[PDB]
Scaffold this motif. Structure first.
Motif, short mmCIF file in Angstrom:
data_model
loop_
_atom_site.label_atom_id
_atom_site.label_comp_id
_atom_site.label_asym_id
_atom_site.label_seq_id
_atom_site.Cartn_x
_atom_site.Cartn_y
_atom_site.Cartn_z
N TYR A 82 0.86 -1.11 0.08
CA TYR A 82 0.14 0.14 -0.10
C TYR A 82 0.77 1.33 -0.04
O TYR A 82 2.13 1.50 0.17
CB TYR A 82 -0.93 0.07 1.19
CG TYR A 82 -2.07 -1.06 1.05
CD1 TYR A 82 -1.91 -2.37 1.15
CD2 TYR A 82 -3.36 -0.44 0.89
CE1 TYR A 82 -3.01 -3.39 1.13
CE2 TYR A 82 -4.43 -1.24 0.61
CZ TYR A 82 -4.25 -2.61 0.84
OH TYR A 82 -5.48 -3.71 0.59
N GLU B 279 -7.57 10.22 8.01
CA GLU B 279 -8.30 10.06 6.79
C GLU B 279 -7.88 10.94 5.75
O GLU B 279 -8.11 12.15 6.10
CB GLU B 279 -9.94 9.88 6.99
CG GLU B 279 -10.69 9.15 5.98
CD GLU B 279 -12.13 8.99 6.40
OE1 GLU B 279 -12.34 8.71 7.48
OE2 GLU B 279 -13.09 9.31 5.55
N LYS C 170 -9.23 7.98 2.11
CA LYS C 170 -8.78 6.69 2.16
C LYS C 170 -7.95 6.39 3.65
O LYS C 170 -7.35 7.36 4.21
CB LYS C 170 -7.42 6.63 1.09
CG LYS C 170 -7.80 6.68 -0.26
CD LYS C 170 -9.00 5.74 -0.63
CE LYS C 170 -9.59 6.10 -1.90
NZ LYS C 170 -10.62 4.80 -2.33
N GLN D 46 -5.24 3.99 6.42
CA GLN D 46 -4.01 3.38 6.50
C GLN D 46 -3.67 2.62 7.66
O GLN D 46 -4.21 3.16 8.98
CB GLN D 46 -2.97 4.32 6.33
CG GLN D 46 -1.51 4.07 6.75
CD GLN D 46 -0.47 5.08 6.25
OE1 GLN D 46 -0.18 5.67 5.30
NE2 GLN D 46 0.51 5.43 7.57
N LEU E 155 -4.60 1.29 -2.24
CA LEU E 155 -5.33 2.30 -1.60
C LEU E 155 -6.05 1.56 -0.57
O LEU E 155 -6.89 0.77 -1.18
CB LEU E 155 -5.77 3.53 -2.37
CG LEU E 155 -4.98 4.71 -2.79
CD1 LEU E 155 -5.74 5.48 -3.76
CD2 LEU E 155 -4.53 5.44 -1.67
N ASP E 156 -6.36 1.92 0.60
CA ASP E 156 -7.17 1.38 1.60
C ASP E 156 -8.46 2.26 1.84
O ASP E 156 -8.37 3.39 2.22
CB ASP E 156 -6.51 1.25 2.91
CG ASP E 156 -7.09 0.04 3.86
OD1 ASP E 156 -8.40 0.43 4.26
OD2 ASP E 156 -6.41 -0.67 4.26
N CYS E 157 -9.50 1.59 1.33
CA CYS E 157 -10.83 2.55 1.09
C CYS E 157 -11.69 2.45 2.61
O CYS E 157 -12.66 3.01 2.68
CB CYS E 157 -11.82 1.83 -0.03
SG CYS E 157 -11.26 2.18 -1.43
#
Lengths: 140, 91, 4, 91, 140, 4
Positions: free
Chosen positions: D18, D63, D74, D76, E135-137
């Motif tokens: 990521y 965010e 997005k 993390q 990408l982490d939604c």
């Protein structure tokens, strides 16, 4: 609060996939003594109050099939989820009796958006498998 | 809202890229060392600390033996990969 | 001893 | 005799594969969250537990915001990778 | 004993490599606000009693050169070692101002057989860098 | 916000 809520009606499921015998055509050798691990892990997680399920010598297809189904179940009354993989492998890959399965694939079945019943709960993956072919020679 | 990859824990038997050892009659080094520490500490220690105990055991008390020089006297170190958000206690 |  | 890869700790700002977020004026999410937890807990908690605190903070309180839909909202999650053999205390 | 001996004469070294400006030809954009991280980390590890060393905008070559030298030093009176990498990257790769450096390369300088002065002591690597492009939604 |  800084620790996971483990007071749910049940500690949760513990899936142990124990692969010992592979198809001749895969060229993969038998993983002797792995039954000892599966028997041990079964007894240990039993006393931790996990509902244990031993599955032996599954094909890549069945492994995915099992994970897909285990994820669709309802884990609302379960505190956590444990998956134990005993088999051959490589970096990010674990072997089904008939071929490789990439970890990420079966892992995704349990991520946030997918398995909403486990969201916020600890998903633990214990893996006994090779991650390549390097050898550690040690020191001192 | 939280990450989708959060609350995951991967406890690997060996480090990234390395082989993993298994004994024909005793079982793999990692598993027999994990079950031993769970039995003694599941009711006393946080999970991240238990696995650390398992790391020390596998790293300390195991060493391969083989007639094949390439595989003789090799060591192994488990690899913990945590993306957990809180501490984990089995009690 | 064997390898995985 | 011990493994050569033992006693290593990799605290990654994000999960495997990521992107990682950084703010132009505030700094990266990971670092500002790591320094905050070190200040408050270096003298109270074991290191693996502190990083866990950092995981919860980054995962919880951050965010992304962007005019570019692909990068908007997005999350993390930091990734801890331990091959340590013992507990680590800064005191 | 089950905890690392931290009573050595000194807590140890803390190397912070802070890369903000890359060569135009690398196509890599500037990492704004990274100075805030390096200033913060510097103050935090100072109060933890680590000998801190900030290095800015190093080329791939210099990064390796620095690690090679830092490893050859004697860490006998030092309890641990901390290396902080702030820069662009990908899975197993961190960017020097002029190009990529694979993590494993600079990590090996400190492994058992190589840096005998740190053997048995905690070697910590803190990395602020990308590990790919996913990408982490999020969820919920 | 920016990415690394």
């Amino acid at each position: 609060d800084n620790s996971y809520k483990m007071d749910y009606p049940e500690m949760g499921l513990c899936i142990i996939i124990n692969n010992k015998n592979f198809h001749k055509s895969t060229g993969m050798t038998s993983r002797s003594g792995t039954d000892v691990d599966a028997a041990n892990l079964r007894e240990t997680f039993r006393n931790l109050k996990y509902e244990v399920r031993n599955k032996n010598d599954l094909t890549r297809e069945e492994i995915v099939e099992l994970m897909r189904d285990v994820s669709k179940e309802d884990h609302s009354k379960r505190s956590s989820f444990v998956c134990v993989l005993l088999s051959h492998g490589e970096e990010g890959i674990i072997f089904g009796t008939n071929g490789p399965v990439d970890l990420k694939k079966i892992t995704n079945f349990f991520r946030g958006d997918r398995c909403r019943s486990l969201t916020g709960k600890p998903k633990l993956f214990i893996i006994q498998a090779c991650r390549g072919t390097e050898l550690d020679c040690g020191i001192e | 809202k939280i990450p989708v990859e959060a609350d995951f824990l991967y406890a690997y038997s060996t480090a990234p890229g390395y082989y993993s050892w298994r004994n024909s009659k005793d079982g793999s080094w990692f598993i027999q060392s994990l079950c031993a520490m769970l039995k003694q500490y599941a009711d006393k220690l946080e999970f991240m600390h238990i696995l650390t105990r398992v790391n020390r055991k596998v790293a300390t008390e195991f060493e391969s033996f083989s007639f094949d020089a390439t595989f003789h006297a090799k060591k192994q170190i488990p690899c913990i990969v945590s993306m957990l958000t809180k501490e984990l206690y089995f009690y | 001893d064997e390898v995985x």
